[PDB]
Each structure stands twice: as C-alpha cells, then as structure tokens.
Write a protein that binds this ligand. Structure first.
Ligand SMILES: *[C@@H]1O[C@H](CO)[C@@H](O[C@@H]2O[C@H](CO)[C@@H](O[C@@H]3O[C@H](CO[C@H]4O[C@H](CO[C@H]5O[C@H](CO)[C@@H](O)[C@H](O)[C@@H]5O[C@H]5O[C@H](CO)[C@@H](O)[C@H](O)[C@@H]5O)[C@@H](O)[C@H](O[C@H]5O[C@H](CO)[C@@H](O)[C@H](O)[C@@H]5O)[C@@H]4O)[C@@H](O)[C@H](O[C@H]4O[C@H](CO)[C@@H](O)[C@H](O)[C@@H]4O)[C@@H]3O)[C@H](O)[C@H]2NC(C)=O)[C@H](O)[C@H]1NC(C)=O
Ligand SMILES: *[C@@H]1O[C@H](CO)[C@@H](O[C@@H]2O[C@H](CO)[C@@H](O[C@@H]3O[C@H](CO[C@H]4O[C@H](CO)[C@@H](O)[C@H](O)[C@@H]4O)[C@@H](O)[C@H](O[C@H]4O[C@H](CO)[C@@H](O)[C@H](O)[C@@H]4O)[C@@H]3O)[C@H](O)[C@H]2NC(C)=O)[C@H](O)[C@H]1NC(C)=O
Ligand SMILES: *[C@@H]1O[C@H](CO)[C@@H](O[C@@H]2O[C@H](CO)[C@@H](O[C@@H]3O[C@H](CO[C@H]4O[C@H](CO)[C@@H](O)[C@H](O)[C@@H]4O)[C@@H](O)[C@H](O[C@H]4O[C@H](CO)[C@@H](O)[C@H](O)[C@@H]4O)[C@@H]3O)[C@H](O)[C@H]2NC(C)=O)[C@H](O)[C@H]1NC(C)=O
Ligand code: NAG
Ligand code: NAG
Ligand code: NAG
Lengths: 202, 212, 172, 284, 173
C-alpha cells in the first residue's frame, strides 16, 4: 500500500479545505497541532470520534478518500495525515490573512568558510510577498538550475500579514568558482514582470 | 479519563540501546493493543510497530525488524519499546498510541489510534551549528549542519525583534539541518555598526555569537 | 498406478491434448491426426466430480458450545474442557489426513484404470488386425484411412472386412 | 482446509449483536453505559476485549454458568413484576455507579435499605403462571464495615434465602474490607434463580438483599456468545470465528477452533490437497 | 489438614511445575506468630507447616487482622492459606478470643470467605481439630486483602506460578 496526499493548502479562517488521500488497497485521519501529539480526527473514512466539531467530515469514493473542514477556526490549522501499516505524506494547513504586497529581493554572496567547506551555498531572499504560492527559478550565469534550491517560507506575521522566502542552493568548490555570475529569477503573482538580481565576486 | 504517560526525553550515543516506556491510565492495558509511531523532527509520522497486549505477539516494520523489541509489564500497566543498535537517523519523537483489537484480529488493520501519549524525544546524535555571515539593506546569519532541530537564534538577545525572520530549518541529503535568520537594517546603519547573532543549540550545548 | 498404464507403458503425457483427458493420436498415409476420447474422459470426470460430498455430506451446524479459551486457572473443569477439545481436534485432524490420503490414492488408481480400460477396449476392437507395440501404441496392419480411424475411435470398427489383408501383412 | 479469514464478521444471516464496551453480564444487570442493550436479542453476542464495568463493584459466583445460560437464552427481554417490599426503602444507589448526573445503580436490581429505623424480615412471593422459564437475578450486599452494615440494615448480620418448590439457595453476607474498586470496599454478589412454569419463587431476607425488579424471559434456540475484536460487516456468511466470517465450501478449516454456525471442522493441518486429476507425467 | 477441591489444587500446582516459594513481608500486628503443635514435630520440638503461619492471640486479645499485598510483578502469585477448625469451644476461645472467627481473602475480582466451625472430628495423629487449605491466585496488577477475626492460618509468601509442560503421575516404577 502507498498513500498519497495534496500538500500545504494555504487557507484563510472561515473557509472550507479539502484534503485528499488515495489508498492503493480503513483510512483514518489524524491532526498534529504544532508541538503536540497527533489526534484522531476521523475513523472509518467517515466516522468522527468523540470531541471533534461537526465541521470535520470524510467522504470515500472508490479508492480515494477526502477530508473536508468547513468554517475552519484557528485551532484547525495543523498538519493532517491519512493512515491505513503506512502513513500519508502530510498536509500543512496554515492560516492566511489578506494583505497585498510585493517582493523585496536581496542577494547575499557566500562567505569564505563554506567555500573551504567544499559546500558553497548561495542564497537569495524575497521579503514581504503576499500570495506565498510564488515559485522562484534559480539561474547561474543566466542558466536555470533545478534540483538544488531549497526553499523556506515563514508563517503569517500579525505585524505585516505577509510572507518571506529564502531560497538556497549549494555547489561544489570547483563548481562554484567556475560559474561567473549568481542570481535567482523570481516569478510572482503580485509582481508582473519577473525581477533579476545578480552578483559576481570582486 | 484515558491517558498514556510516556518516559522522559533520552539522550543516547550511536550504537547504544534505548528503552521508552508508556504507562496507561484509566483503562486496562490488556484491553487494547498498542502501536508505536515515530516522528523524525519535521519529517512526518512513521509507523514503527504494534504490540498485542494480552498475548504478546508483535508486528514490526521490515525496516525495524530485529532491532526493536516491544514488551508489556501488565502488573504496572506499562509497555516498553527498546531500540538496539541506535543510529543517528533514529533521533525522533516516539509516541505510544492505543489501538482497539487484540482478540481475533490484529487491531491496526481495522481500527484507529484513538489515544496517544505525549511522546519522548529520543535523540541519538550531536552536531555543532556552524554559523556564517550574510552581507551584500538586509543582513543575516546562516546556521548550517546541525542534527538536532531545536535551535534558537537571537540578536544580542534584546536588540533585534522586528524585521527578523526565522526561516524554519531545512533538510539536507547528509541528514543535517540548516536555517537562516535575516533582518533588514536602515541603509545608514549597515555601514556604521554591525549586529551579533547568538545561535543557541541545547542538544549540542553550543552557543555561538557571531557578527553580521 | 495399479495398472501400469499411466506412468507405466504409456510413458508420456500429451501437453498438446486440451480437448479431453484421454485420446488417440493416429498416423497413416494421409497424415498425423489427433482426437480425444469423450466417453472415458466423461467417465473419469463423473467419478471425480463428487468424491467428497459422498463421505462428508456437508457442514453440520453448531451454535452453542463449550468455552475453548480461558483467562484464569480453575482446575478440574477447565482441564476437562481443554482435554475434550484437544481430543476432538486430534481425532478430526486424523480423519482429514486419512480421508485425503485414501481419496488421492483412489483417484490415481481410477484414472490409471480408465486409461487401461480405453487401451483394452481399443485392443479388443482390433481383434487380429493390429499388434500392440508395447508403448501404448497400436500398429495396424492394413490401409486404414481417416474413416477407418474414426471408426476405431467411434467403436464401430468392422474388423471382419480387413482380416484377410491384415493377416497377410502380419504373417506373410 | 480453509486457512484464511476475511477478518470481518458478516451480519447476515445471523442476528449479530456487537457489545460496545459492555459484557453480557453488565448488559444483563443494567449497567448505566449498557442502557442501550435493554431488551436486545441476538443470535451471536460478540463481546469486545475493550469492555469494562463502570458500576457498583460486583462479583458473580459461577460467573461462567450465568454467562453461558444468558447467552444461550438469546435475549435480554426483561419483564418488570410488581414486587411489594413493605417497610424498606427502595431504589438505593451509590456514587460509584453514576446514572445521569447523580448517584444510581443497576437498572435491573433494587437496592433495599432500612426505612426509618427498622428493617422487617421481607417475605415476598411470585408465582410462575406462564409457560416459560423465568430468570430472576438477585444479589447480596457485602458491606465493608460493621458500622455500614448496621447503618444500612438494622440487623447485625442479615441473610438472603431465595427458594422454589424444588430448590433453595441461601447466602450469609459477611462484613470485611476488600480491594478498593471504583472508590468502594463493599461488593455485590450476583445470584440467579430459574422458576420453571407452575413453580413459585419465595424471597425471604432479613438484610443485605439486592432484590430483583422482574424476570428475564428465558428462551431456547441457536444463540451463543463470542469473544472477538473483529469488526462487523455487511455481508453474507454462515460460519463465524473470532477471526471473522469464513467460507464453508471446504470441509475443514484451520482458522480457529471456536466457531459458530454451519462451519467446517477444525483440524491441525494448514493444508490438505485432494487430487482432482491423474498422475502427472510430463514430456522429457 | 483437608483441602476442599483437593484435585484442583493438585492439578494446578503440578501444571505450574515448580515449588519456588518467595517469602513476603506480612505484618501481623497484635497476634502471636509461628504457632505449632506436637502432631507436626519439626526437629525435637513442636512445629508446623513451613509455608504456613499459625497466628494465635497475643496476650488476651485478637485484633481483626486486615493486611494487603499488591502484585506488582508480571507473573501470577499463588497464596496458600488455611482455616483452623478447633475441636472444642474452649480451645477456640483459648486460641482466638472471639467465639467464632472468620477468614475472608479477596482480590479485585474475586473473594472467598470461610466461617470456621467447632466440632469433634475423627482422631488423626492425636488431634480432633483440622486445617482447611484454600488458595488464591493474584494475577499481575491485582491486590490481595486478608481480613480475619480468628482461625487464620496465614501464608508466609507466594508460590511463583508458571506455565509449561509439567504434570504429575502416580507410579511406583
Ligand atoms: C485467528 O485468531 C487467533 C486469535 O487471535 C490467532 O491465534 C493467535 O495467533 C498468533 C500467531 O500465530 C499466536 O502468536 C504466536 O504465539 C507463539 C506462542 O504462543 C503460545 O503462547 C500464546 C500466548 O500465551 C500468552 O497469552 C495467553 C492468553 O493471554 C496466556 O494464557 C499465556 O499464559 C500467555 O500469557 C503470557 O503473556 C501475556 C501477554 O504478555 C501475559 O499477560 C501473561 O501474564 C503471560 O505472561 C498462546 O496463545 C499460544 O497458543 C495457545 O492457544 C492457541 C489458540 O490460538 C492454541 O492453538 C495453542 O495450542 C495454545 O493452546 C501458545 O501457547 C509465539 O511463539 C509466536 O511468535 C512468533 O513470532 C514472533 C515474532 O512475531 C517470534 O519471535 C516467535 O519466535 C514466533 O516466530 C506468535 O506470537 C497467538 O498465540 C495465537 N493465539 C492467541 C490466543 O492469540 C490466529 O493466529 C488467527 N488465525 C488467522 C488465520 O488469522
Ligand atoms: C484494610 O486494609 C486495606 C488495605 O491496606 C485498606 O484498604 C485501603 O484503604 C485506603 C483508604 O482507607 C485506600 O486509600 C485510597 O486509595 C484510593 C486509590 O488510590 C490508588 O490509586 C491512585 C490513582 O487513582 C493512586 O494515586 C494511589 O497512590 C493509590 O495507588 C485513593 O484515591 C484514595 O485517595 C483519597 O483519599 C486520600 C486520603 O488522604 C486523599 O489524599 C485523596 O485525594 C482521595 O481523597 C485513598 O488514598 C486504599 O486504596 C485501600 N487499599 C486497598 C488495597 O484496598 C482498608 O482501608 C483497611 N480497612 C480497615 C478497616 O483497616
Ligand atoms: C466425640 O466422639 C468421638 C468419637 O466417639 C470422640 O473421639 C474419641 O476421643 C477419644 C479421646 O477423647 C480418642 O481416644 C484416643 O484414641 C487414641 C487412638 O487410639 C486408637 O489407636 C490405638 C493405636 O495407636 C489403639 O490402641 C486404640 O485402641 C485406638 O484404636 C489413643 O491413642 C488415645 O490414648 C491416649 O489416651 C488414653 C486415655 O487413657 C491413654 O490410655 C493412652 O495411653 C493415650 O494416652 C485415646 O484413647 C478416640 O480415638 C476418639 N475417637 C475418634 C473416632 O475420633 C471425641 O472425644 C468425642 N468428643 C466429645 C467432646 O465428646
Ligand atoms: C459414429 O457412430 C455413430 C453410431 O454408431 C454414427 O451415427 C456416426 O455417424 C459415427 N461417426 C461419427 C460420429 O463421426
Ligand atoms: C422491554 O420489553 C417489555 C415487554 O416486552 C416492556 O414491558 C418494556 O417496557 C421493554 N423495555 C424496553 C427498555 O424496551
Ligand atoms: C527458594 O528460592 C527463593 C528465591 O528463588 C529464595 O529466596 C529462598 O531462600 C529459596 N529457599 C530454599 C529453601 O532454597
């Protein structure tokens, strides 16, 4: 058996969120609040245990079960797993507040220590972008590279109600020196024309 | 009230063996089977095994066969899971969860884990967080290559609180974690003065203060 | 294998035979042909189709019985219940083992007998016109075309009208 | 030999009764969390391993016999009779057995205590004028302290005698401390009496009586009880084991020696091949 | 002595396959321990069963013994206790100040109470009094409570019960 699941649904309070799982072969849905033991949310693909609100629901159709949360509150934001023994990949339910913004890009050259570490890490930062669904395509010597960038996005800040990302990829010491100019090409929803910020040593 | 109370956090060394315990309360241990589920730090739940209380028959994953042993002390309503030949990858939170079937069926095929323990953080590793500067505006610190996830980053511990963004740690093919913390600074203040970032790592017990 | 037909003087099965269980392969001037014998196959299948309903008619219906799993330790009565159940289980396991062994032995003997019966029936049709070569295959001593062969398989082989030619071919 | 099971109990053609958290005796006595099982009937009572008791700590001498005969009767149909307890307080309860928000007791048992400052020698009777057996479940209260014994029952040592034309059964309650169960050191002992048609029941007690409220209509039939954690399913099967329902097309099975219905016979062998063909001699 | 349900006790002891006896610390307050008799001569003097404790009155009183032992181990414990039936009422009150004691041994799940009687019995080895031997099995996580106001032949410990291939046979071979 292998379980599959749609990951990282970013939703606002008061809406409906649908999470999927496709058992290849009794699926149960658990929720893990941040820093707390998992909790049983529904069993038998439909039945809800004692203590959960009626907004949680499950629906099995053939070999694909789905979990629906309606009018979700603050406590419903957590990570959700399906179980059948094997677990699901996981699906983070964040909170979303509406605040239009535009990314602010900064590029920080690698330090000398990681060059001698044999692991030269190049990072690019986008600060205060609202959608959080933007994907940034890295580019080295104006050539795209994939399978190396690692992306990290902070949560929603009540002060600003926007999001920040730091994308980072690593190269070998020989591979780092050979490359001429480093950058990361950003594709954004709130920002129309893609922005380039590059740098070179010197 | 039904409760599962687990042992305290364990810090071991690779190649050792660890024993986690789960004391049940509010019901009889032999009425319910007991599953053990691990969670690596930020890598999702992973089913470890299942003990059939009242007859002692087990079921482990092929990944854990031979090096995990589950037992029940029915006198004290306790269950024990010992993991031998500890590796670095075994650093995780372990949960005991209660499953229903013990007679006629193996419970975990048909029933959910309706009651969980608080879990114990079995950490078998130690690695120092290497700190690097980040300057070109904005400036930050890159924390790299530490195994146990809980690491805090401050800036003089009272200086910088707004404009600082703590990106949660990210994996690596080597199995070590890395994060970054960057703060915007007024363009005049970037050249006149620099700040110091304090990276605190309790499991490796390392506190590194570095500038820019 | 009491008659030595199957795994005996036949010496080989026919994986190309899918029409039935027992059959003929003929070779004459026209060319090699193959057919299956429906009567013998049907007889063997009929004798095999049951063979377990005729001893264990069906499952009897049991509703309330003794307890067979015990938590505590009582003593005499629990010992007696355990003993009774163990005795019943051992006796029924022996019954199953012996029944299956006997049925398998009889099935093997039955199919061997059907093969031998087909061989003997064919040999009796060819009174003096054919000779048994010993490998389960008959040498017929005259012009025997496909109509002749299908008459042999039919069971209406007219041995009288080939007797002179066959006898002349055999004894010169 | 049928050596595998689907793992689920088919709910047809047999009237299965899944006992959620209730044992047969707990549903019989009338435990609060067993109130949903009143007047239930079954062909097979499936008793889960997770069942627990949540009422006054009781004890059934010859527990196996009562469980067996109640399971065989195949019904929990309880007919309330008019018992006349004169001079005693009825409907006693305790905080160990919380029905609703307040104290309570078994719903099929009547805890009689002293009224005012006296406890008369109860002497009641019920005739069996119907043509079925009646099952009467009564009890005897064992208090923890002599002070409690005299505070509930003015006598220093009561006794309970329940008798019919053919048999009698007398219990002398004792006073002593017992292991702490659900906040109490006192116990109930559960006894039963079967009144055959045309017989009479006489209850004579001078203290420590947990009287019946009526009778359970006994029956004869194809009913039984099974201990299994297999989940019930919507499906057809004639043979039920604790491992679930199994097909009875094969004559023998190796799943479980505990069976119900038109089941195959249990054998120790995991496989028995029956030849349905001839000796296999392949080419070459 | 006399064992009600002697066959059951013999069967379960034989099945356990061991006589391993673990002495427990029982606290009998206000009674005299290690009673003995001249019918059971251990050494040159009077004695008793080595696994049983004959408790008599101390001074001129016999308090209501109420002791407990929890089973915190993961094996069953077998407790062998007894009830003394005296021959004469004078002997009953001389050993036990009460005119009629009783012995109740109980666990969370079961209880077992014996009312000793006083009467003359056939003369066996110089005595008309008897011991009645009862047993209790305390499963793991259970508790044993012994409440007696007289006529108690208390246990000294427990026999470690086991499961296995053991049995008993009557044979002179
Ligand atoms: C249908 O369902 C039934 C019921 O669920 C299934 O039957 C079970 O099947 C499994 C798998 O085959 C059996 O597990 C195997 O057990 C053997 C050893 O078995 C012997 O002990 C069994 C258990 O005894 C303990 O529990 C009983 C009941 O509580 C108790 O009376 C005992 O005294 C003992 O209790 C001790 O342990 C308790 C729990 O720790 C404590 O509370 C207690 O205080 C004691 O310390 C016993 O049941 C078994 O069989 C008896 O009963 C069966 C009836 O099923 C009967 O047929 C037998 O003849 C016996 O009379 C034995 O006495 C164990 O060696 C196996 O281990 C294998 O695998 C492990 C790794 O997984 C390896 O390390 C081993 O080397 C070995 O390879 C396995 O665990 C289970 O015993 C059996 N019975 C029950 C009641 O569960 C059946 O399989 C299902 N069938 C299908 C087709 O689905
Ligand atoms: C004859 O001898 C027996 C055995 O020695 C005595 O029985 C004991 O009686 C005492 C009280 O008389 C019982 O004590 C009570 O135990 C309850 C159960 O506690 C257990 O479980 C809890 C978990 O729920 C554990 O925390 C605890 O450590 C025990 O393992 C307690 O809940 C009771 O607490 C109540 O009273 C205390 C008193 O201060 C309060 O502090 C509490 O908050 C609460 O209000 C209480 O402690 C004991 O359990 C009995 N043991 C047995 C084996 O039955 C008889 O009393 C004695 N009789 C005579 C006449 O001498
Ligand atoms: C209720 O009724 C019963 C039965 O009638 C009485 O029980 C009898 O009690 C008397 C004494 O009270 C017992 O007598 C004793 O018997 C002992 C056994 O002797 C038998 O075996 C020896 C062989 O060893 C034979 O020689 C003998 O004939 C008997 O067959 C004797 O050893 C005792 O002897 C001691 O006392 C006498 C007294 O003089 C001395 O001479 C001896 O040397 C020795 O010191 C004694 O004789 C008798 O056995 C009991 N019978 C039964 C069946 O139990 C109860 O006493 C009575 N109770 C009341 C309250 O009335
Ligand atoms: C076989 O024989 C039957 C009757 O003896 C006859 O009707 C038939 O034509 C023959 N040939 C066949 C079936 O090919
Ligand atoms: C049970 O049945 C009896 C008679 O059939 C009836 O008097 C009683 O009210 C019923 N009780 C419940 C709870 O159904
Ligand atoms: C019997 O064994 C127990 C524990 O094994 C020990 O404490 C005791 O001294 C032993 N007694 C004898 C007589 O061997």
């Amino acid at each position: 058996s292998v379980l599959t699941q749609p990951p990282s649904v970013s939703g606002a309070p008061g809406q409906r969120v649908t999470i999927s799982c496709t058992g290849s072969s009794a699926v149960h849905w658990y929720q893990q609040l941040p820093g707390t033991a998992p909790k049983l949310l529904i069993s038998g693909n439909s039945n809800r245990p004692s203590g959960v609100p009626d907004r949680f629901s499950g629906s099995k159709s053939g070999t694909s079960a789905s979990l629906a949360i309606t009018g979700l509150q603050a406590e419903d934001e957590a990570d959700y797993y399906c179980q059948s023994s094997v677990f699901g990949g996981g699906t983070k339910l964040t909170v979303l507040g509406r605040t239009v913004a535009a990314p602010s890009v900064f590029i920080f050259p690698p330090s000398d220590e990681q060059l001698k570490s044999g692991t030269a890490s190049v990072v690019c930062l986008l600060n205060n972008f609202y959608p959080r669904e933007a994907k940034v395509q890295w580019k080295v010597d104006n050539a795209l590279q994939s399978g190396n960038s690692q992306e990290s996005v902070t949560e929603q800040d009540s002060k600003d109600s926007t999001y920040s990302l730091s994308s980072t990829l690593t190269l070998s010491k020989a591979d780092y020196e050979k490359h001429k100019v480093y950058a990361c090409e950003v594709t954004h929803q709130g920002l129309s024309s893609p922005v380039t910020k590059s740098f070179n040593r010197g | 009230q039904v409760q599962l109370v687990q042992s305290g956090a364990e810090v071991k060394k690779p190649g050792a063996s660890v024993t986690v315990s789960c004391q049940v309360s509010g019901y009889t241990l032999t009425s319910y089977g007991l599953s053990w589920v691990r969670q690596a730090p930020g890598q999702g739940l992973e089913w470890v095994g299942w003990i059939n209380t009242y007859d002692g028959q087990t079921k482990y994953v092929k990944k854990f066969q031979g090096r995990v042993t589950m037992t029940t002390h029915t006198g004290t309503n306790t269950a024990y899971m010992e993991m031998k030949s500890l590796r670095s990858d075994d650093t995780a939170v372990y949960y005991c969860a209660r499953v229903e079937g013990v007679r006629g069926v193996m419970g975990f095929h048909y029933y959910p884990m309706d009651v969980w323990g608080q879990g114990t953080m079995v950490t078998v590793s130690s690695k120092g967080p290497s700190v690097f500067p980040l300057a070109p505006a904005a400036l930050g610190c890159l924390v790299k290559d530490y195994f146990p996830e809980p690491v805090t980053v401050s800036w003089n511990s009272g200086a910088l609180t707004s404009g600082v963004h703590t990106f949660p740690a990210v994996l690596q093919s080597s199995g070590l974690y890395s994060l970054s913390s960057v703060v915007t600074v007024p363009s005049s203040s970037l050249g006149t003065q620099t700040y110091i970032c304090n990276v605190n790592h309790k499991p490796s017990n390392t506190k590194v203060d570095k500038k820019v | 294998g009491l008659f030595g037909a199957i795994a005996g003087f036949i010496e080989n099965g026919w994986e190309g035979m899918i029409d039935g269980w027992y059959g003929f392969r003929h070779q004459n001037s026209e060319g090699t042909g193959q057919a299956a014998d429906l009567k013998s196959t049907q007889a063997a299948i009929d004798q095999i189709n049951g063979k377990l309903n005729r001893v264990i008619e069906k499952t009897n219906e049991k509703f309330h019985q003794i307890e067979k799993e015990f938590s505590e330790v009582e003593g005499r009565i629990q010992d007696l219940e355990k003993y009774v159940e163990d005795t019943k289980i051992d006796l029924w396991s022996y019954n199953a083992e012996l029944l299956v062994a006997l049925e398998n032995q009889h099935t093997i003997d039955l199919t061997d007998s059907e093969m031998n019966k087909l061989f003997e029936k064919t040999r009796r049709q060819l009174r003096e016109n054919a000779e048994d070569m010993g490998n389960g295959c008959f040498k017929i001593y005259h012009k025997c075309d496909n109509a002749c062969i299908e008459s042999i398989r039919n069971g209406t082989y007219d041995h009288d009208v080939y007797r002179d030619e066959a006898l002349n071919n055999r004894f010169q | 030999v049928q050596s595998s099971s689907t793992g689920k109990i088919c709910n047809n053609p047999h009237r299965i009764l899944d006992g959620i958290d209730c044992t047969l005796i707990d549903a019989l006595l009338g435990d609060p969390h067993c109130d949903v099982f009143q007047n239930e009937t079954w062909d097979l009572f499936v008793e889960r391993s997770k069942a627990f008791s949540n009422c006054y700590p009781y004890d059934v001498p010859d527990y196996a016999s009562l469980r067996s005969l109640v399971a065989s009767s195949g019904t929990l149909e309880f007919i309330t009779e008019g018992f006349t307890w004169t001079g005693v307080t009825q409907n006693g309860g305790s905080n160990a057995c919380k029905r609703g928000p307040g104290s309570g007791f078994f719903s099929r048992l009547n805890w009689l205590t002293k009224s005012g400052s006296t406890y008369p020698v109860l002497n009641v009777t019920m005739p069996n004028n119907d043509n079925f057996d009646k099952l009467y479940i009564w009890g005897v209260h064992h208090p923890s302290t002599n002070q409690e014994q005299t505070s509930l029952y003015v006598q220093a040592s009561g006794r309970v005698t329940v008798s019919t034309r053919r048999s009698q059964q007398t219990i002398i309650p004792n006073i002593g401390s017992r292991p702490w169960v659900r906040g109490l050191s006192s116990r109930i002992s559960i006894y039963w009496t079967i009144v055959k048609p045309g017989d009479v029941l006489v209850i004579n007690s001078n203290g420590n009586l947990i009287a019946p409220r009526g009778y359970f209509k006994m029956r004869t039939g194809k009913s039984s009880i099974m201990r299994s954690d297999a989940p019930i399913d919507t499906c057809i099967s004639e043979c039920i084991t604790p491992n679930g329902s199994i097909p009875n097309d094969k004559p023998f099975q190796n799943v479980n020696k505990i069976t119900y219905g038109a089941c195959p016979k249990y054998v120790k062998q995991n496989t028995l091949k029956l030849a349905t063909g001839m000796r296999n001699v392949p080419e070459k």
